[PDB]
């Protein structure tokens, strides 16, 4: 026998989505290829967030996107691996180019009316395959009733 005081640890992170969405499966295949064949850390982060669950993907509002568009970020492509929601407290939506998993109808309509562009992640892979000139945004993770009651 061998004396192993320490213990080899199995991985504690997701390697595949639990979702049976076939479009998400195709997106996972695409970003697996991209993260394997490119040196960009952006593709690895995007693939690992595509693995994640819904409580680990909180929504991002247009007010949050407009907040992060300030100070020289007006021309960067906004990348959100989550749902982009509308905020009616924000009366004036600036022009922006956002790629997301999905948009709400009001958020998509308000972006297109303000003159920006909405993209999917495969369109993001086509136009910025290495994630150049991109602003990666996450929503508030701890802003949940369960997390408040923890």
């Amino acid at each position: 026998g061998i004396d192993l005081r320490w213990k080899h640890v199995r991985s504690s992170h997701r390697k595949a989505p639990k979702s049976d969405n076939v479009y998400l499966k195709l997106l996972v295949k695409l970003y697996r290829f991209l993260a394997r064949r490119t040196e960009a850390p952006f593709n690895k982060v995007v693939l690992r967030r595509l693995f994640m669950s819904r409580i680990n993907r909180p929504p991002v509002s247009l007010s949050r996107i407009a907040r992060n568009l300030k100070n020289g970020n007006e021309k960067k492509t906004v990348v959100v691996v989550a749902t982009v929601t509308d905020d009616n407290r924000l009366l004036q939506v600036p022009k922006m180019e956002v790629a997301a998993l999905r948009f709400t109808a009001k958020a998509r309509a308000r972006i297109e009316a303000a003159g920006g562009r909405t993209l999917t992640l495969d369109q993001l892979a086509l136009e910025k395959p290495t994630g150049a000139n991109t602003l990666l945004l996450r929503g508030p993770k701890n802003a949940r009733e369960a997390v408040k009651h923890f």
Partner: protein, 52 residues
């Protein structure tokens, strides 16, 4: 066939959904020049020779 559009335009509270994937052809996406032009050179093949 003529009435199907009116049928889905008369459903209140529902719109035809937006897909999370714009191009479903993964072969076209991967073998497009935009992705292939920025890739790193392959670090191996499908089969690997046994070293020792």
């Amino acid at each position: 066939i003529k009435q199907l559009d009116a049928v889905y335009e008369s459903k209140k509270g529902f719109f035809l959904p937006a897909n999370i994937v714009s191009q479903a052809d993964l072969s076209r996406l991967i073998n497009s020049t935009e992705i292939q032009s920025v890739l790193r050179a392959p670090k191996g093949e499908a089969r690997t020779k046994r070293a020792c």
